[PDB]
């Protein structure tokens, strides 16, 4: 190992951010506080300079942006509540404002996080599993944390996955999220601005080991079109990819990468097919330095290759 991997969490929480290839990396050392790695032409950070806060060990960590001027990191407090870590160009690091309402959840929730697509102002919808194993959705909409929409019953510890885009030819956003029922089947989950939430599940896959991590993005929007990619940890110890292309719905599903067994994943993406696009990004461990953390590259010129094998700090 070197001393740097070892002071990341073995199965550490993974988030990621970007502004197209401007890229954060946030996880969790083995003290509990949440650090960020970065890449501005090159990797840097993730010292124990570059921490943002602290979480109860073994947190759940999510993070989303609006480019790279606002970042919002959500993890629980040692109080099984949610938190948020927030970043705004000119102001730096604070602690953001949904801590005030210390919203309790199961201690063994997972997060997920969105800023709401193509919005005036700045929307955001948190994803996370209460204490009867129902998803809820706590949302910002510029004047207080308010509990939103109650999805369902999930798997107590299920992996959450989501993603906002806004299609052209609508005049508001759209919502998807995936998680994992208590049959084993993986599910997504949909709102769209003219029909709400749709009220049934759709399968993505059909058994997942159980509370397996589930990490989502989405690219390309157009006039009712999307692309979307849903990754998770199989029964074979590696990253699964289900795609969503438009025109061919969910057609294709496949593994990735190696991974250590119970690794948690993240994703960004940017660009699309229509400017020699998309880029993808997941992180992840794979047992490199032991508990390093790596990424895996997709893009148009070379396809799927191992991106950075150790990210700062290893
Ligand atoms: O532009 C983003 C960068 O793309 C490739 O160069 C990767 O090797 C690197 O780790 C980073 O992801
Ligand atoms: O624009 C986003 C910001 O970039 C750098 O300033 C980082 O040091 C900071 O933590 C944040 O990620
Ligand atoms: O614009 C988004 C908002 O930014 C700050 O006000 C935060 O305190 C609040 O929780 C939310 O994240
Ligand atoms: O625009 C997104 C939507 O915003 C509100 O209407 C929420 O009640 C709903 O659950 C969803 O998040």
Redesign the pocket.
């Known amino acids: 190992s070197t001393p740097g991997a070892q002071q990341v969490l073995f199965r550490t929480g993974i988030a990621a951010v970007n502004s197209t290839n401007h890229l954060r990396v946030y996880f969790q050392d083995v003290y509990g506080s949440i650090r960020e790695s970065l890449y501005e032409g090159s990797w840097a950070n993730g010292t124990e300079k570059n921490v943002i806060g602290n979480a109860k060990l073994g947190s759940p960590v999510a993070a989303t942006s609006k480019e790279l001027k606002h970042i919002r990191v959500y993890t629980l407090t040692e109080g099984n509540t949610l938190q948020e870590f927030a970043y705004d160009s000119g102001t730096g690091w604070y602690n953001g404002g949904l801590g005030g309402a210390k919203f309790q959840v199961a201690p063994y929730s997972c997060i997920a996080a969105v800023f709401?697509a193509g919005?005036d102002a700045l929307?955001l919808?948190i994803y996370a599993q209460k204490p009867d194993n129902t998803i809820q959705?706590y949302?910002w909409?510029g004047d207080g944390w308010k509990e939103?929409?109650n999805?369902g019953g999930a798997l107590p510890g299920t992996g959450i996955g989501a993603t906002?885009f806004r299609y052209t030819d609508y005049n508001?956003?759209?919502?998807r999220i995936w998680f994992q029922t208590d049959d084993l089947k993986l599910v997504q989950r949909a709102?769209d601005?003219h029909k709400?939430?749709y009220p049934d599940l759709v399968t993505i896959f059909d058994r997942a080991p159980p509370r397996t991590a589930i990490a989502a993005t989405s690219f390309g929007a157009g006039n009712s079109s999307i692309y979307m990619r849903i990754y998770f940890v199989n029964s074979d110890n590696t990253i699964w990819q289900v795609c969503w292309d438009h025109g061919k719905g969910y057609h294709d599903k496949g593994t990735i990468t190696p991974v250590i067994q119970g690794s948690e994943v993240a994703i960004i993406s940017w660009g699309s097919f229509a400017n020699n696009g998309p880029d993808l990004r997941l992180y992840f461990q794979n047992g490199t330095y032991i508990s390093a953390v790596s990424e895996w590259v997709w893009n148009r010129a070379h396809g799927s290759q191992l991106g950075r094998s150790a990210l700062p700090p290893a």
Not at 172 to 175: D, E, H, K, Q, V
């Open positions: 709401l919005t929307q919808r959705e949302m909409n939103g929409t999805l906002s508001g956003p759209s919502i709102y601005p709400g939430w």
